[PDB]
């Protein structure tokens, strides 16, 4: 048994880290509708920029 490395199966998040930064704002082409061909647009429950 020669000693080598091994990516071990302990899933402990101590001595390891992810860069949990802020979630980016999603692009939203689905929100506002063209009511009849014209501007009757909708939000439908988000921070719609």
């Amino acid at each position, epitope marked *: 048994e020669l000693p080598c490395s091994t990516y071990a199966q302990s899933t402990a998040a101590t001595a390891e880290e992810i860069e949990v930064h802020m979630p980016p704002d999603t692009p939203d082409r689905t929100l*506002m509708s*063209q*009511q*009849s*061909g*014209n*501007v*009757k*647009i909708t939000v439908n429950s988000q921070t719609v920029r």
Partner: nanobody, 117 residues
Framework: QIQLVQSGREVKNPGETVKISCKAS????????MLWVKQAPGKGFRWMGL????????TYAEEFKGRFVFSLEISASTAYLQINNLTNEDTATYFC??????????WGQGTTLTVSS
């Protein structure tokens, strides 16, 4: 408000052109197009797309491929349908629809394109 004052008689030859520029009173800028409409002899409505007044050009019809293509004078708030290469059945009515009254809420009354021998 929204009202596309459509052009008069658009005379066309066999394979000739058609151009109905409709001066769109109520050419806005903000949030909505002007739903253009082709008008056949019996069909009632036949939508030629959405295209704004200060938007400027029409997102055209779907099944109207052939001659028809939307255009407009964007700074004047005016739209138009130009249909070059005039076939036999090119005689029809044209309209815009200005998105105030938040559907296509300024319906064009019709512009008479007459392309015949």
């Amino acid at each position: 408000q929204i009202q596309l004052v459509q052009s008069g008689r658009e005379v066309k030859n066999p394979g000739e052109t058609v151009k109905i520029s409709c001066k769109a009173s109520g050419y806005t800028f903000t949030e909505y197009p002007m739903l253009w409409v082709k008008q056949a002899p019996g069909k009632g409505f036949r939508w030629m797309g959405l295209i704004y007044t200060n938007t400027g050009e029409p997102t055209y019809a779907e099944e109207f491929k052939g001659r028809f293509v939307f255009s407009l004078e964007i700074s004047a708030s005016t739209a138009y349908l130009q249909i070059n290469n005039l076939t036999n059945e090119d005689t029809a009515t044209y309209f815009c629809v200005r998105d105030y009254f938040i559907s296509l809420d300024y319906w064009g009354q019709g512009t008479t394109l007459t392309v015949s021998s």
